[PDB]
């Protein structure tokens, strides 16, 4: 039996990161809280700035501890700006191809070809264009170049696959990302 393949997409090796910087009220970002011109696609020039500004990832802001006890003079409740993102450090990419019908030579299975090792595998996966949490293709890229660094452009996702939890002077990323390698060596 063989897979009757519809179109196919790319999945990256997504390792989830995040960062946050706290700026004071006296700073120039902060006024009576967070700028409304900060959005899930704004960046701070201040962050741990190695950041791939073209990549898939999410931002936000909140007031933090403000006081004479949290780094900013005059007891001002201060701003904390943060980005939670995914990254593909080892350039790994898998081509995923849903099987429309199994044909002689169960539902919602897909061929998962690794691209360096060319090792093949079978597993359930999302249909093209659905950043559905839980299954392979949470993150779907439209081109091998897009999956290589998870370009913001070619690639889709839910951003709730990654959680962040702020603390005082850093934050704590969480990942709900299903790993290809953890679905494709058991059924390889």
């Amino acid at each position, epitope marked *: 039996l063989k897979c009757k393949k519809s179109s196919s997409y790319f999945v990256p090796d997504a390792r989830s990161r995040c960062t946050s910087v706290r700026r004071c009220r006296w700073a120039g970002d902060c006024q009576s809280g*967070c700028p409304p011109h900060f959005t899930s696609n704004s960046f701070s020039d201040d962050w741990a700035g190695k950041m791939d500004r073209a990549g898939l990832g999410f931002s*936000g802001c909140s007031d933090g501890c403000g006081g004479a006890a949290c780094g900013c003079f005059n007891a001002a409740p201060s701003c904390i700006f943060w980005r939670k993102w995914v990254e593909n450090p080892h350039g790994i990419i898998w081509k995923v191809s849903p099987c429309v019908a199994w044909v002689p030579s169960l539902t919602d299975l897909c061929e998962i070809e690794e691209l360096k090792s060319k090792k093949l595998a079978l597993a359930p996966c999302n249909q093209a264009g659905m950043g559905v949490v839980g299954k392979v293709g949470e993150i779907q890229c439209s081109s091998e170049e897009s999956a290589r660094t998870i370009k913001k452009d070619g690639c889709i996702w839910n951003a709730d696959l990654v959680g962040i939890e702020l603390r005082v002077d850093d934050a704590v990323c969480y990942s709900k990302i299903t790993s290809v390698e953890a679905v494709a060596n058991y059924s390889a």
Partner: antibody
Amino acid sequence: QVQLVQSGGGVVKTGRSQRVSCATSGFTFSSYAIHWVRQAPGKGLEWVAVISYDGSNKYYADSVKGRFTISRDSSKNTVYLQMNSLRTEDTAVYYCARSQASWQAFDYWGQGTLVTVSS
Amino acid sequence: DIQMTQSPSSLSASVGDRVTITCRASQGVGTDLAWYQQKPGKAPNRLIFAASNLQSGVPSRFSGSGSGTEFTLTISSLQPEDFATYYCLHHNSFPLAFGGGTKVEIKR
């Protein structure tokens, strides 16, 4: 500092409608999901629903699913819980609370808006 | 569906004591679990997230631990304000769910 201000409680006939609302400041509204947790009088806390950062994902407790709606207005920094075909047991203080992913724990709470549903 | 059961449903204890509430789930919930303090007719507060992380600003005498189906919240030294009802919440899957709660009353 982070704040969430409810309004819209009141009395309502068994079977009718109600809208509680939650208007937030302090943070960046369209980066956080919002949940509704309700408390009958002197009972435990009960989780009602949650809407994701963009409205795309809405999930509901099994007791109101099919009867309540959550929704959000980017411009007013507000989240709404609509309550249709209300029943007597639905009487509770409705608290709305912040959550960054739609699946994470809530951190900052609302002050509650009381809804009393009785014939 | 996942079910969070707290015990003891309520306990009576005194200032200086050590207090340990146990939240128990009917399925794995990993470390997606949180603890709340609710003084009466007030908004609950988050005490603990990630099952072990101290909500920023909650006193150091508070601590969480557990995984899977067992979680234990622990106040080393009950201070007079720590009397409240206490709730666990599992956010490992939708729908989320709270525990029953443990009321911590004064023992006399």
